Point group: C7
Chain length 188, copies 7
């Protein structure tokens, strides 16, 4: 957890490497998506918006996905705040991670040459995470359709195409993800 120190007008101040990159409006979405990591990302997005509502924000995504409602919290925050939120896939983006990648500002969604994208949403992401919550079948079907509609909107694919392809738990290459409309450009 490396640090970097900057000498300011009021002394020297230390950051961890992630906080230092946050100073440059860089957010890291890494690891499984759950409530804890989704809320810290929402907090970072809101912080950057208040600091400057005009400059783009960048989310670097390396994630196998995870909890749907946690991912939706990030999605809604990305869409609401004034700044454009650019997304870059490094490593992989699956399930909710793939959805958030595809939901970056139009024209500003990127994948690196060896990254991979899987839109498939496993059952695990829809189930209750709290002991006392049982997520029922109809709520799952509603959420699955809602996610498909979001993907269709941001990719330009038809709803029927998204619904067919999301059943398959296969990865798309960066080139294939770009052609599908999940990202705008492969960075080479």
């Amino acid at each position: 957890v490396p640090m970097v120190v900057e000498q300011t007008s009021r002394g020297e101040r230390a950051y961890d490497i992630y906080s230092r990159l946050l100073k440059e409006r860089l957010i890291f979405l890494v690891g499984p998506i759950d409530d804890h990591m989704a809320n810290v990302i929402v907090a970072q997005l809101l912080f950057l918006e208040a600091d400057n509502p005009e400059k783009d924000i960048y989310i670097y995504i390396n994630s196998p996905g995870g909890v749907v409602t946690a991912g939706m919290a990030i999605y809604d925050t990305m869409q609401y705040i004034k700044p454009d939120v650019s997304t870059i896939c490094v490593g992989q983006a699956a399930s909710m991670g793939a959805l958030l990648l595809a939901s970056g500002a139009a024209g500003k969604r990127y994948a690196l040459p060896n990254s991979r994208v899987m839109i498939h949403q496993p059952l695990g992401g829809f189930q209750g995470q709290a002991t006392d919550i049982d997520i029922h079948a109809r709520e799952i079907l509603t959420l699955r359709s809602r996610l498909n509609e979001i993907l269709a909107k941001h990719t330009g694919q038809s709803l029927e195409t998204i619904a067919r392809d999301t059943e398959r738990d296969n990865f798309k290459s960066a080139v294939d993800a770009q052609a599908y409309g999940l990202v705008d450009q492969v960075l080479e």
Copy 2:
């Protein structure tokens, strides 16, 4: 802990009167939220406070501690549902200052109160049936008051362990506006 030395990201947002109510509700996190509310009131008793809620609910008496603090302090307490709000989280969402309760478009709200929230959390305490029924009625009355629904409607609907969409929560009176 996205952190600088000499705030973490949450403490930094607290400086702007923003409180995060995230994860299961229990005594530990409820008392931290009570402490934040009291701090912000003393710092400025006129300015609005904002609680962003992403919670599956939890312990009833812990949630009631937050509810009573929200109602007593002078500042308006605005509530925003991000992700979900269930049980006590849903109640606290609906209990924000009138006109200042918000939900994001893909958030979901479930008023249903599972048994787990009423049971004793301490080893030596058994919460008895009559106390559970009293608390359930009190929660229904709080929801009816803040939503504008009748006591029947809350009492009938709270049996269903189902989520309302943001639009449906707004129509029900659980929030005032969907931020879109």
Copy 3:
């Protein structure tokens, strides 16, 4: 994760956790099960605040299911001894030792919030030995139970016989009913 509030001092920044910041305004939090560890921190806070200003009121906000009797008694004795008035506010709940400490605040300065609940009942668990090599014997339990009843009768104005009969019941009183019983002076609404 406990939030910080950091202030700028003469040569940089100075950080408090949220509880330490509220302590600066003479606010003490009694939260969770009562045991030796948390009781001694509360005793330490009370003594600190007295030395800082022996005249100004101290406030203890109570959200506790109770716990160890002797740990609670350490707080009780410290509250009574120090010069400042100790005001008590029930938030959430106060049971067993938590209810006793709530009822033992300075006269006229004991408060409950509208949805808080108070149970004076003292379960056996609070009287048993907490150390491996300590067995708390029956007569010591009966002595402590009577002592607690006498403390409650004194601070509530109820008779000893009323307290002894009612402390049986493992029932909660509402904030209004606790006020009528003499456990608090006023419901803050």
Copy 4:
């Protein structure tokens, strides 16, 4: 909660009270906490060898030799060491309470004191140490002699009464000679 205060430098609440020559002896007595108390006693003596030191005791007792380390340090250092029982003091905790400077041993009204020394306190705490019967009898006698000296009770009285694992009230502890005064306002 490890609460903080800032003074004109930051302290935890216990460190802040240490600045006022206040030491907390809380929880089971073992080597780790006894050595911290010894260190605090030595620190306060060097800072000012004249002013009284105060040890507030809330403890069920514990390891005998660890308590003896505290006892020997209390007796050696120049300052009077005043002792205050809050909550309870048992076994080594009761011995240390009774061993404060004469006239400066206090108990709060609802505190309780038990001199009884259970076997557990005498047994080896290290894996490779077995504390043998004669060493236990020697330690028990020394503890009884220490209590007799500081209480004014006879050795025979201490030896008989320490067998009983009963608590004394604060008033009864004062009458027995374990403390000098019950603090009431």
Copy 5:
């Protein structure tokens, strides 16, 4: 205990000199920290070389690929030094440093072999299927062939056996440019 120097911990102090340590098994957590360090150093100075010292048995393929893609994209040359060992993804990243700036110490060892473990799903709900494994194995061989100068089939043959190369043999194979003595 990680030592400090004046205040930095030793690793943060070396980061100030554009030194990154890739140590231990490669997974998402450590790969993202390395990506963050690479991006920080590029922004601080996009012209000065960056150095990654590698002592790793390898690990998760996609995590390593995240490091690879970041090394290739940023402007600074990324020099690589093998200390101790480099296996699997560790060996690939070592071989992927800037041409002419890949080093091994005399008693270092390099194994390009990629065990199955690195390709399997690390998340509970992800099953990495056979054809995706074959695609990744092929990509890795192509990356090694490009940076070593060996032919694709030569890499495919040699990566099958889980043997280490000495520093001298790794240099002759094209995995590093020079043995530092």
Copy 6:
């Protein structure tokens, strides 16, 4: 919980006054910390005495020997004070303080006996063999005989028994020079 007094912890405050605490079981981790403290204090002032307060049941022999060798090498006199107890390696280090500057408190107890546990391998891949144990036992006995003034034969006989000496009896035996009273 360690109290503070920047904030020092209480032990760091006392290190500023050349006070080192040897407390708890002796192992590599705590022995190296004590060695580091001894070397720091020597470099800070090679003339002033150093004080080690000992409350320990003993422990790993080679770790204790690291402390012994450092105590003997450095220029400052190293004074030792037994508080609570000193057993096995703890007792050896107590007896190995600077001549005339080894102290015990009135209720402290000292046991020179060395249990088998201290000689066995602590690392997974190390087996300490019988002859190495006997060599170390002899080396420890010679150290005790040298610093106490007792004969080697006396040490070898008395170390066999797992019994404690009182502070007075430890002083008479030559394990400490003086019992501190008043």
Copy 7:
């Protein structure tokens, strides 16, 4: 781990005891050798070289040994950097710890009077530490020979002597380690 505080121009600055000694070019190699602790030692060696490539560095060794390749990372760094790296055995040095002890700058390898040195290399140090790595027999034999060649070079013993003696899992005393060529001098007394 204790702290020492030094007064600066702006107030106080704190070190842990090990970091304070690092400021005087002192490195502690303590406990089992593995990748994590070896990389910290490599980092310290490189820092001290850049801070001053002329002054000696000191490694105090109290270790039962451990992972061979992690120790080799330390060995290669000691040999490459410009400063002489002096080694001092405190307590014990076994396997890789003994090799690194013997690999200090010629004339600057020391043992304390009650320290002990065992060159024997147990199988455990050669086995794979990661789940997916199996270290095969010939690689073990190659590494064992390489270690024997390093010891023969630095001790002056013949390769055949090292190979024979290393089989035995016995400790040498400080005096015997000095006579064998594993250290140059036993620090018996301070001059």
